[PDB]
Amino acid sequence: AQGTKFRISLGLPVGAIMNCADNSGARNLYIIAVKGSGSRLNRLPAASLGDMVMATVKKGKPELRKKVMPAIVVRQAKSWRRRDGVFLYFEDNAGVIANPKGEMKGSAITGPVGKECADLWPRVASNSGVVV
Amino acid sequence: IIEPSLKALASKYNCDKSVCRKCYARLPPRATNCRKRKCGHTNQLRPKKKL
Amino acid sequence: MATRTQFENSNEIGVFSKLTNTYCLVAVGGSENFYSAFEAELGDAIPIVHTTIAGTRIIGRMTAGNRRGLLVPTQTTDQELQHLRNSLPDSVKIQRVEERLSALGNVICCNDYVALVHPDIDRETEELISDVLGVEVFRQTISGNILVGSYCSLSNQGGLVHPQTSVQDQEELSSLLQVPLVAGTVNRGSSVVGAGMVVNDYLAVTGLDTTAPELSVIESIFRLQDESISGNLR
Amino acid sequence: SKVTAVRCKKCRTKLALSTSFIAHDPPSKESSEGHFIKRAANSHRIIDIQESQANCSHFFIEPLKWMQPELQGKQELEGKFSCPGCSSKVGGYNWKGSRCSCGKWVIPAIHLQTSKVDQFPLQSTALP
Amino acid sequence: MKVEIDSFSGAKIYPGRGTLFVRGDSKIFRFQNSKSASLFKQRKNPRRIAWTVLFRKHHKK
Amino acid sequence: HQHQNAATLLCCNCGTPIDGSTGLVMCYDCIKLTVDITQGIPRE
Amino acid sequence: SHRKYEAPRHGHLGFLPRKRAASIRARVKAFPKDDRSKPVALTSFLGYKAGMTTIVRDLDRPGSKFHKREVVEAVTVVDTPPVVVVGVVGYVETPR
Amino acid sequence: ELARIKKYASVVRVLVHTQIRKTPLAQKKAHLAEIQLNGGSISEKVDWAREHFEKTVAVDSVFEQNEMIDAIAVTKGHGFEGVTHRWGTKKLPRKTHRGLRKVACIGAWHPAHVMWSVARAGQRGYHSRTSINHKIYRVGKGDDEANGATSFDRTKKTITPMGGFVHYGEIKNDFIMVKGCIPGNRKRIVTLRKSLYTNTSRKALEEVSLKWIDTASKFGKGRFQTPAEKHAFMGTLKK
DSSP states (O other), X not given: OOOOXXXXXXXXXXXXXXXXOBSSSOOEEEEEEETXXXXXXXXXXXXXXXXXXXXXXXXXOXXXXXXXXXXXXXXXXXXXXXXXXXXXXXSSOEEEEBOTTSOBSSSXXXXXXXHHHHHHXXXXXXXXXXXX | OOOXXXXXXXXXXXXXXXEETTTOOEEOXXXXXXXXXXXXXXOOEEEOOOO | OEEEOOBTTBOOOTTTEEEOSSOEEEOSSOOHHHHHHHHHHHTTSSOEEEOOBTTBSXXXXXXXXXXXXXXXXXXXXXXXXXHHHXXXXXXXXXXXOOOSSOOHHHHEEOOSSEEEEOTTOOHHHHHHHHHHTOOEXXXXXXXXBSOTTTSEEEOSSOEEEOSSOOHHHHHHHHHHHOSOEEEOOBTTTBSOHHHHOEEOSSOEEEOTXXXXXXXXXXXXXXXXXXXXXXXXXX | OOOEEEEOTTTXXXXXXXXXXXXXXXXXXXXXXXXXXXXXXXXXXXXXXXXXXXXXXXXXXXXBSTTHHHHHTTOOSEEEEEOTTTOOEEEEEESSXXXXXXXXXXXXXXXXXXXXXXXXXXXXXOOO | OOOEEOSSSOOEEOSSOSEEEEETTTEEEEOSSHHHHXXXXXXXXXXXXXXXXXXXXXXXX | OOOOOOOSBOOSSSOOOOBXXXXXXSOTTTTXXXXXXXOXXXXX | OOOSSOOOOSSOSTTOOOOOOSOSSOOOOOOOOOOTTSXXXXXXXXXXXXXXXXXXXXXXXXXXXXXXXXXXXXXXXXXXXXXXXXXXEEEXXXXX | OHHHHHHSOSEEEEEEEOOGGGXXXXXXXXXXXEEEBOOSSTHHHHHHHHHTTTOEEOSTTTOOXXXXXXXXXXXXXXXXXXXXXXXXXXXXXXXXXXXXSSOSOOOOSSSSSOOTTSOOOEEEEOOEEEEEEEEEXXXXXXXXXXXXXXXXXXXXXXXXXXXXXXXXXXXXXXXXXXXXXXXXXXXXXXXXXXXXXXXXXXXXXXXXXXXXXXXXXXXXXXXXXXXXXXHHHHOOOOO
């Protein structure tokens, strides 16, 4: 489901609590896995801007809580290197929740969206207000 | 679409063989013994199943 | 008429293409099958342009345009701006726009005559849209959503809107847009109707998983529908 | 009722009208024809039983005018054809059978698969 | 190749130099080095930092 | 005269007429048997 | 007893020993294959590495996302004065 | 003796040496080496080297732009390094007595010997390495003040940055500019070799044309390229 993306710096390991950018009632997401992650002894699998993570809701609507459901990172605080040269980074981490196809459950996104997420996922760019 | 004069021409190389029961080898249909050595030249042969 | 096709394996066409009355825009990473959809049906009337915007392939959601003009965001480079000013005709004007709201496609829903913009867009853009596109600008939201370009496909004839939309507010927008409006779903139950499909006067292209009752609703409000080769020879 | 048309998806070409459609509506539902039988190599031995589907997923039409150069040129017993503007596999022709997905038999068959084609009314819009 | 000016003081940023910062209120900030960046995190005012271009325009140096 | 002749939604799967708002625009007789069922269990 | 959690080896075994080289000029172990149809030219060159600097170029690789796009990249500048020949030496082939 | 080489002697090398006086190194002792020839008809190979005794051999006669080469040198050294940074192994936890930057289990009981494959501390660096497939971007001449200039840049400058290359000096010579890092530190004698095999895939056949060269100061956070525009930016100063 996930296409080709150039490697960017991994800023979100397992156990991170990122914000929730959409309007599906959830307040923050708790990352428990990264889809397509590697395998190394004692290594925590880490996420990045645009990866697809399995995540639970720790705060928000009680209907959304206590179930594991996939999510997509839209902002990142660790600085990454774009190919055209610049090192950039947002202010906080953020994610939106999705079905395992990649379609989005929320209606809109507040805050800016990273550009390598809008190219990779077609639904996130449809609901994005500001692209970087 | 297959013109069964040619289907009979191809089934001699594919379907009309025989199979050894022990080593699963592909053998000629008039054979009596398997030609390999890792099954000990066994003679328990079956025909190959047709489609 | 109502042709269906898809970019690489995605149903949405409005993200990856921008179809107008006098031109067309497509992204560069396409197969031979996706390009042959527009080339076979538009012919040589309007120029098809392969382009990218801001280093992206989402040019249907970054740009905003109609018959008369095109608006591109700030991160569009000078190499991509000089390419568009050649391939498009001399009638259309291309203008770079300085925004905080970068994605102009989700923000602006426009045609030849009437445009709806996001309510938190600023006044220096409202002066810019009305003089470049030559369109009256109306600040208004689709009943529950601020992204008016993603959830409301619009043409000169009619306009398809978000499915969860009250009838009492459709009559508001039809009073405002002066075109008849129908709510519906495209791509087998996707509420994002502006990003799933594109439209102009003589063509409307949507995704491959758009079902047959959904395709009836599209061509009806847009009024693009209308034989001797078929017959019995026994 | 009114006449209808069968337009090709991704071609937008009218492949077949009504005044066609030999619809053969009832399946048999009995054990010899309503079920799909897979025998064995020998001795009339049933290995599989499959239940037929709900609705007949084809359109059995008369041989039409646009089909004629594929049926005159290299005339054979079975094959397939396409839309005349996109070269996509729409339906096959067969002078044997291929009952329906739902199962009866037909006649010598000109089947038009209802996957990747759709049916619209020939009259004006419904105006909902 | 475009040369963007530094948002803190006044400097010019040739390509492949210095960081970029996207603040949560949708505004893009550019920085040429960690001097003008780490003075931005401490909430300093560049109309009162003396070496900046924005200061030397204010007193007409 | 602003005219909004829409028949708010028709359906996704079948051709049956008007459904309502708030989602589920799928003509309930469809979703009872067609779509998946998403039970996915053993029943014996 | 077994290792209880498998993991790949640390390090590379085809680069042993890690001992200091015999000279600051590293030897060339092997030269390219001789093709006697072509005119006479040399096979290597000696130079002195100076430093690094940065470059910007238009990437030209079709089917990539960075096609017709500027990329920055790191290059190394090796200072290269002209090199003068002072002798020749011929080797015969023996069975040893 | 030259009739001896023409009759016998399958392969033919040529003893060359650099010119150390045209170089900001403090060393006065040149580096002698061998270079094999790949001409034809080994009587003709020594007829080539007969004409070139005490003759200079240029750079552009050997290499050209967009060619894949190899870079062979001796690595930067670091002296006696421990078992963690040499082999990249895991650090022990904090609670361990008498040292945590070690390797815990050297071996098993049988065999009663330490095997050759364990990680063990010693010399790190100063090894001979070969790095293949480095792509040449620019071969600039010596008496040419447009070394840093490009077709899209149009400013007259050398590739020596402001204040010179750090720890090196001045490139007032010919030079080779190649993509990506070369083994060995600065001031190191580096052998560039032709490619052993013909490469095709996609990346050897690419042709590059540069946009811009970075000649800002390497001596730290350099913010100007040429000193003609440092003076225009800052204005008139006291000195």
